[PDB]
Design a protein around this nucleic acid. Structure first.
Length: 1409
RNA sequence: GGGACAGGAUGUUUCAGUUAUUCGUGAAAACGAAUGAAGUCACUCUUAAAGUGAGCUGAAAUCACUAAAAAUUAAGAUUGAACCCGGCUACUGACUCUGUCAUCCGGGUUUACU
């Protein structure tokens, strides 16, 4: 009836192992369980980050900015001239508008390395700096001043660069005044490089808008094409001001002006332009120093009478836009969860208000509304915001909000303050104690007994929802009584931070932050110490508290400090000093120091004061005030803080990866559930189990590539090594617990011993939350002792006398019992639970206390403490993945839940990867030895399914996890065997996601259609002397190919050839292909069924057609190897030979023409500057290793030009044409500024063909290219493309099972690609090992991608004895299923006839029916 | 961490021009300026014009449908983002701080809407 389903997930990052099942009974059967692994392709195969997409968007936006600025400038100039602009005038105006220069030019290098250094250290090299300001602002201002041509900055940059050359003095001065070389090293290797980048930016062409305006102040009188325009503008200065004001416009202003379908005619509107110019410069946030410049521009534009005269009059330097500030671009949403009066009204109508009123009339409910007069005035939720925006309050009136706030305060009262023992009176585990009866008598009297049951049910639901919220899984409530705030909080505001600090420093009202600059132990300052504390916490992550407590405890015990614990105790001293200094600055007293006298509070102070100057606070001020009241620093502890939802991940790319992983896993689970017959009634419960590690971060640093692989690997290696040192081989058990003696036999035990639980695994089912795979419940024992252990209650009578004497020094059971009781009673719960914080004597005392009587105080206390060790809340990444998976699984099965009525019930539990891997995986590894974790420097794919299975196996935490692995009478190795030998399937289904095929996307524009880079498309000239005619460039043998029967050639190309205008005196005739007509005909033959004449013309045009592209002359030198390339590598015939293959039908011209640009490449390599550097042959190269040959190659070409014009552009790349590789060319027809048709050739980025044509009788045409419908546009022309009528076709992904001719092998085939078929083989694992030479340690070690080497490919094709299988493309095989039956698919290396015949036979079989 | 805005500069391709000229000058020591910029090198053909290729200079175009603007180089099962319009009844931000503007809120999103 109660059908149970489970889905265990090992979130390994790239590889996500899933073990899932769905059973009517409590324990799953063998067939029900399935194992999956997600392959999760990297960013290249599936895009998660948007960096390239936005780079493309902003490139197009810059192009459109220039186009619209030119459009508006032409409109205005033609309006003032009352006549159309000539093409020369248009060219001159465009020349003026080109190369605006920058206005911000922030940076191009990552300066985050130096962001953690205080500004006071650089005053030796930068006297202009001050210690009262952060280094970020000062360095940014200095760089901007150098960019904005600030004379002082320009001078001090050179002063620094000259002074810092002698770095020996810089290294000598350091350490004299308690400086740090590690932090002061940042003055080199990043900031010096940034300064040099600023030096070199000037000669690249970057000039800034002010220098651009200065340059275009000149070159306006010098350009003779602008004379009529200058005359009509009545002055060079007026026209310059007009041009500069127009150029200063951003894209958005031009868009606003042209955002009108009536602007298609390019009409000049005075008022529209004025309003658009006013709308700009009002969009901007002007700095305080740039005030009264915003005022000037806005007075000019708003007060403009003619706007055009205002453009000609206003100084363009004033109209340069300020820096962009998208701080309010998407404010964070408050995550605070509020008891909703609206939902309370929909659920209980009015009765909850009477509940609140009845509870209020009680002396126990005095003081619960202390600050509700000043809290309710601030909107806290999205629903209240919507109601107030409507102006009418029906569910969020002040009275309703008051009632909800006091209701939640009563429900959230602490146990010291709860007068009705809520969350205990409502729990099922409540006893019949006198205190429970007194609490229930206090209730039913204040509230009244007429509606006790409904209020109690509401309390039950509220506490269940709050428990879900605390765990991080508020989303699975699916019927909430609370609501998320979902509204933006205020920013720092310089005054909200004062309130936050006062809350942190336990001050009711803080007025100033002078304590942040108070001196500590000399010239150290509170700010620097808090910065160092936060830096240490950030470096150590979530592990900081553990080693901090360990170091302080070991220092208290007087142990020998380590190199790290020394730093930690120095940090402790820093915390003490900073707390004392803060207290004396704020004169605070009465035990308020110790509240913030921890590294966490000082790091929080640093974050609030320093980090995120323009950031947002966590929650709304209403939530902050309510939480402050429920903290009550002036009081003890009244009420518990408000629940808050888990914020979405900040990474976005990680968010997309989690979204796709959740969708794939939800689709797997939906397939599993829909495969079942389950019918009327039969509620379904799904339980989620998750595991996580630092390997998740390490692998996601490669899935998106993170752009920081080295740094992230270095950071995560430290954490992983620390975790390994935390778990080790579980030291302090063999060496400290047993002390060389078996606990139960006393025999000498070496490294052959084993570790097993003290408490029987059966007893940890009826009480206490875990089997306690901890350092106390397990002891290093011997095999004979473990056999004598059995599964009953164990006591000190079974402990060896010699072992007891070694551990304690006394063999008396009563004496040892009383000593254990005394030792356990002397240690607090914090030291008891955290085993590292105990020395070996107390560790033995705590461990041995489990052998005592059931009534023993020490044993009972230890069991009580360790039964509720932690809540195991989910990580934010885990919470987001869980939310996405649950939402998508609900969506997928929504139809399957409407019909058949199954209602989905979701539960979720996080399981530590530590316990799973270190305890549960080891048992199965011993059982089967294929479950052992490899150490091959990588974690093999299929073993993530093993990890997920162990995560399910780690669900022995019973009485808590409700997947109905209950009863649990059979324990110890019996349960392990029942798990492994019956549950874990042999098959591992590898799921490899991929981006949607462009043939399936309806929004083909969301995919990169064409590759960036345009190719020159050329036609061979035709030379005619008389009866002699040649195809080529010149009459030389290598420059042209002789044509036999040229009359046929000229008859075919009668309408496509044009002749040279300047006629020579018998100096032959040159016939060149008309580019426009040729391109039009090549488009016509591609887009329409053309006549045979047009097809012949297109064939001849394509035979005369060739493609070149300019490649930089730098390519003559190998930068990677710092070696110049030889003439054989440079002048290879592949890059310069044009093949002419006209058949008898088109005259007769067979031969190869060398590209005449080869002479220009020969001139490049044979010139004096490079004659010796270029070697004549590949074998001549040696160890010359020219380090910077690119520099001299540049200096060949960077000749200083004549300064004719100040606005001339710079030259940086010099290139010569070479014949490139062609792959699915596309020719795009566009229009220039004059409206003429221009054709530019691109390379297709995605697939070109959508399938193969199928005739009326099912025969597949394997030779014709069936171009996709998205390329068949009136402006698109597929290179060498022809029209093809295909009313019926077979898609590239129509897999069919072909006639393999065998029984042991199942082969499926699909067309796959236009040239190579896809073959999927279902085969036994042993047979695959026999065919190929591949070897591995069972299929659990098999990789998802198998890279067969050439010998293995030959072995495959040979031992296969199967011509239709072919060979894998470059020996690459993608595995679909792992196990004894191995399923995999591959792309064939080469096309084969019988492969096409087999697919054709399968398609015919499917097509006849 | 990411996301977005603003772009800057150089490339590639298309088209066009250019292989000059006039002055200082009459030495024509080979340079300096002007002609808006460019204006110098090869193969072929020489009739001694030119053809071809490159360079240089200028502009234009640089995903398509597709255009006034936007969306368009992500994903798609779902979405996210972007942009525009209306509003300051109100979450947020900047101001000149009841008064506008917005990256905010609501809506729309393809030739839509104002």
């Amino acid at each position: 009836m109660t059908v149970k389903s489970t889905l265990a997930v090992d979130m390994g990052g790239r590889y996500t192992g899933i073990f899932s099942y769905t059973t009517d009974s409590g324990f799953p059967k063998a067939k029900e369980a399935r194992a999956y692994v997600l392959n999760m392709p990297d960013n290249d195969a599936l895009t998660y980050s948007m960096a390239a997409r936005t780079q493309t968007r902003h490139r197009i936006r810059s192009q459109q900015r220039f186009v619209l600025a030119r459009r508006l400038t032409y409109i205005l100039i033609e309006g003032k001239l009352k006549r159309k602009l000539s093409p020369r005038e248009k060219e001159a105006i465009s020349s003026l508008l080109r190369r605006r220069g920058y206005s911000r030019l922030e940076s191009e290098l990552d300066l985050s390395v130096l962001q953690g250094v205080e500004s006071g250290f650089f005053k030796c090299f930068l006297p202009n700096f001050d210690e009262d300001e952060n280094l970020l602002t000062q360095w940014t201002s200095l760089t901007d001043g150098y960019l904005q041509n600030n004379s002082d900055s320009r001078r001090q940059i050179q002063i620094f660069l000259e002074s810092s050359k002698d770095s020996k003095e810089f290294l000598t001065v350091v350490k004299s005044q308690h400086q740090d070389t590690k932090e002061y090293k940042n003055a080199l290797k990043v900031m010096r490089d940034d300064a040099e980048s600023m030096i070199e930016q000037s000669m690249f062409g970057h000039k800034h808008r002010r220098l651009y305006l200065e340059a275009i102040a000149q070159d306006i009188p010098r350009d003779s094409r602008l004379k009529p325009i200058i005359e009509a503008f009545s002055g060079v200065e007026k026209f310059h001001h007009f041009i500069g004001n127009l150029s200063n416009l951003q894209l958005r202003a031009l868009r606003w002006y042209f955002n009108d379908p009536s602007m298609k005619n390019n009409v000049f509107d005075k008022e529209r332009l004025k309003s658009v110019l006013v709308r700009a410069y009002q969009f901007f946030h002007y700095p305080k120093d740039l005030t009264q410049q915003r005022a000037e521009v806005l007075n000019a534009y708003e007060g403009a009478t003619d706007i055009l005269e205002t453009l000609q009059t206003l100084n363009p330097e004033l109209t340069i836009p300020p820096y962009e500030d998208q701080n309010n671009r998407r404010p964070p949403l408050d995550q605070t969860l509020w008891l909703s009066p609206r939902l309370l009204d929909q659920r209980y109508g009015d009765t909850w208000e009477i509940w609140v009123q009845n509870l209020l009339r009680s002396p126990l409910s005095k003081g619960i509304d202390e600050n509700l007069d000043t809290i309710l005035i601030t909107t806290d939720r999205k629903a209240r915001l919507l109601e107030r925006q409507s102006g009418r309050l029906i569910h969020y009136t002040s009275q309703k909000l008051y009632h909800s706030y006091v209701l939640q305060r009563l429900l959230d009262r602490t146990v010291e303050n709860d007068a009705y023992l809520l969350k205990t009176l409502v729990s099922s585990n409540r006893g019949n104690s006198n205190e429970i009866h007194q609490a229930q008598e206090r209730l039913t009297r204040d509230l009244g007994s007429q509606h006790i049951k409904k209020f109690l049910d509401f309390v039950r639901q509220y506490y269940d929802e709050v428990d879900k919220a605390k765990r991080g899984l508020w989303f699975i409530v699916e019927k909430p009584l609370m609501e998320r705030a979902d509204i933006h909080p205020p920013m720092k505001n310089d005054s909200v931070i004062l309130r936050l600090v006062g809350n942190i420093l336990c001050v009711s009202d803080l007025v100033d932050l002078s304590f942040w600059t108070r001196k500590v132990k000399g010239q150290s300052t509170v700010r620097s110490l808090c910065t160092a504390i936060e830096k240490t916490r950030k470096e150590y992550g979530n592990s900081f508290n553990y080693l901090y407590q360990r170091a302080l405890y070991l220092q208290s015990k007087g142990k020998k400090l380590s190199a790290e614990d020394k730093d930690f105790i120095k940090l402790q001293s820093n915390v003490l000093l900073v707390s004392d200094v803060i207290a004396e600055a704020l004169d605070i007293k009465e035990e308020q120091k110790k509240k913030f006298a921890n590294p966490f509070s000082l790091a929080q102070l640093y974050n609030i004061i320093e980090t995120e100057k323009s950031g947002f606070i966590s929650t709304t001020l209403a939530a902050v005030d309510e939480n402050a009241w429920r903290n009550n620093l002036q009081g003890k502890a009244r009420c518990v803080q408000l629940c808050a939802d888990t914020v979405r991940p900040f990474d976005g790319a990680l968010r997309n990866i989690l979204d796709r992983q959740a969708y794939e896993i939800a689709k797997l689970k939906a397939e599993e559930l829909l495969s079942t017959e389950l019918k009327n009634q039969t509620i379904d419960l799904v339980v989620l189990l998750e595991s996580n590690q630092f390997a998740f971060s390490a692998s996601l640093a490669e899935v998106k590539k993170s752009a920081n692989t080295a740094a992230i690997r270095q950071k995560v290696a430290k954490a992983q090594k620390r975790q390994q040192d935390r778990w080790l081989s579980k030291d302090e058990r063999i060496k400290s617990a047993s002390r060389g003696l078996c606990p139960y036999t006393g025999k000498n035990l070496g490294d052959k011993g084993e570790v097993d639980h003290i408490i029987p695994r059966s007893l940890s089912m009826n009480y206490m939350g875990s089997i306690l795979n901890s350092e106390a419940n397990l002891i290093y024992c011997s095999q004979e002792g473990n056999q004598l252990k059995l599964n009953g209650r164990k006591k000190l009578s079974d402990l060896a006398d010699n072992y007891l004497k070694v551990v304690f020094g006394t063999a008396d059971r009563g004496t040892i019992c009383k000593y254990i009781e005394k030792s356990v009673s002397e240690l607090t719960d914090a030291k008891i639970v955290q085993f590292e914080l105990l020395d070996r004597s107390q560790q033995d005392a705590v461990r041995h206390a489990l052998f005592l009587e059931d009534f023993s105080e020490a044993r009972r206390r230890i069991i009580r403490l360790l039964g509720k060790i932690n809540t195991a809340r989910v990580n934010g990444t885990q919470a987001w993945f869980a939310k996405s998976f649950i939402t998508k699984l609900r969506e997928l099965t929504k139809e399957w839940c409407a019909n058949n009525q199954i209602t989905l019930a979701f539960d979720l539990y996080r399981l530590d990867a530590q316990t799973v891997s270190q305890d549960y995986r080891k048992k199965f590894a011993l059982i089967n030895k294929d479950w052992a974790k490899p150490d091959d420097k990588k974690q093999p794919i299929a073993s993530h399914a093993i990890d997920a299975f162990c995560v399910f196996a780690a669900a022995k935490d019973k009485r808590n996890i409700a997947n109905v692995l209950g009863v649990f009478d059979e324990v110890a190795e019996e349960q392990n065997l029942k798990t492994i030998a019956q549950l874990m399937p042999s098959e591992v289904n590898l799921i490899s996601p991929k981006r949607k095929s462009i043939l399936d996307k309806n929004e083909v524009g969301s995919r990169a259609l064409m590759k960036e880079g345009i190719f020159a498309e050329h036609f061979l000239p035709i030379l005619v002397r008389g009866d002699d005619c040649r195809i080529g460039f010149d009459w030389s043998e290598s420059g042209s190919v002789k044509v036999k029967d040229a009359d046929k050639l000229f008859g075919v190309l009668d309408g496509l050839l044009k002749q040279s205008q300047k006629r020579s005196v018998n100096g032959f005739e040159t016939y060149t292909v008309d580019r426009i007509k040729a391109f039009e005909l090549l488009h016509d033959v591609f887009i329409r069924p053309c006549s045979q004449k047009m097809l012949e013309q297109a064939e001849v045009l394509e035979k005369l057609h060739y493609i070149t592209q300019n490649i930089s002359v730098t390519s003559v030198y190998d930068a990677v190897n710092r070696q110049f390339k030889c003439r054989e590598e440079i002048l290879k015939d592949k890059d310069f030979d044009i093949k002419v293959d006209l058949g008898n039908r088109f005259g007769s011209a067979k031969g190869k023409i060398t590209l005449p640009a080869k002479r220009e490449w020969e001139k490049l390599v044979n010139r004096s500057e490079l004659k010796n550097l270029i070697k004549d042959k590949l074998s001549d190269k040696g160890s010359e290793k020219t380090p910077d040959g690119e520099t001299l190659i540049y200096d060949i070409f960077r000749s200083i030009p004549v300064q004719k014009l100040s606005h001339k552009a710079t030259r940086r790349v010099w290139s010569l044409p070479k014949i490139p590789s062609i792959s699915s060319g596309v020719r795009i027809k566009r229009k220039d500024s004059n409206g003429n048709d221009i054709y530019q050739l691109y390379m297709l980025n995605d697939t070109k063909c959508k399938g193969f044509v199928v005739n009326e009788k099912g025969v597949i045409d394997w030779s014709s290219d069936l171009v996709a419908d998205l390329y068949k546009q009136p402006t698109l022309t597929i290179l060498n493309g022809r029209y093809l009528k295909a009313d019926q076709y077979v898609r590239m992904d129509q897999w069919y099972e072909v006639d393999c001719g065998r029984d042991d092998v199942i082969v499926k085939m699909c067309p796959g690609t236009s040239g190579r078929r896809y073959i999927e083989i279902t085969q036994s694992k042993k047979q695959f090992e026999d065919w190929t030479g591949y070897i591995s340690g069972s299929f659990w070690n098999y990789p998802v991608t198998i890279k067969l080497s050439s010998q293995q490919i030959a072995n495959f094709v040979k031992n296969s004895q199967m011509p239709l299988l072919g060979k894998p493309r470059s020996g690459q095989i993608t595995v679909i299923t792992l196990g004894n039956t191995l399923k995999y698919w591959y792309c064939v290396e080469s096309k084969n006839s019988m492969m096409n015949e087999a697919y054709q036979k399968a398609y015919l079989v499917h097509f006849n029916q």
